[PDB]
Amino acid sequence: AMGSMAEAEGESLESWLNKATNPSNRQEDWEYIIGFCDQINKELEGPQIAVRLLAHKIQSPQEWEALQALTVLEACMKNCGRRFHNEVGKFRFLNELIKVVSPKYLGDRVSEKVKTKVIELLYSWTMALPEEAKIKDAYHMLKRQGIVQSDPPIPVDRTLI
C-alpha cells in the first residue's frame, strides 16, 4: 500500500526524528541527530522514508521543530551518501521545500528564519551537488519568481566546491 513507511521501518525512523527534533530540546542533540543518519544508512528504504519524514517536520508550524529538522536534513546530506542525495534531488521532495517558502502555500505562516535556512540549503546544494540537476531547477525557478532575489551567503569550508 504505502510501503515500509506504514511499517516498523517508518515508525522507527519517525520515532528517531521526534527525538532529534523535539521542541523541548535545550539545543541540538547530536546523539539523536547522527543516530537518525545511522538508521538511514542501515535501512533499505531509509532515504525514501527519511526525506518524506524530514519534509513533513520542516513544514511544521512550530519554529524550533522545523529548524532542528533542517539541521537533521543537513546532517543527512553530509552523512548518508549519494543514496540520500539522490532522493533529495527529486521534485517529489523539493516541491515540499518550495511550499515552505512560497506564499501561495505555507509561505505566509513560516518564520523568516526557516525560509532563509531553506534557501541557504538549496543554494548550498547547487554549489556542492552539481550532479543533482533537479535541485538547481528548483532553485532557479525560485529566482525566476522573485522568492529568491539574490543568492545568499552560506557556510563554507575547504571541503566545499
Binding site: F91, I98, M141
Partner: peptide, 8 residues
C-alpha cells in the same frame, strides 16, 4: 517515478 516541479 517522480512528480513535476511545483510551479508556484
Amino acid at each position: 517515478s517522480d512528480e513535476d516541479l511545483l510551479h508556484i
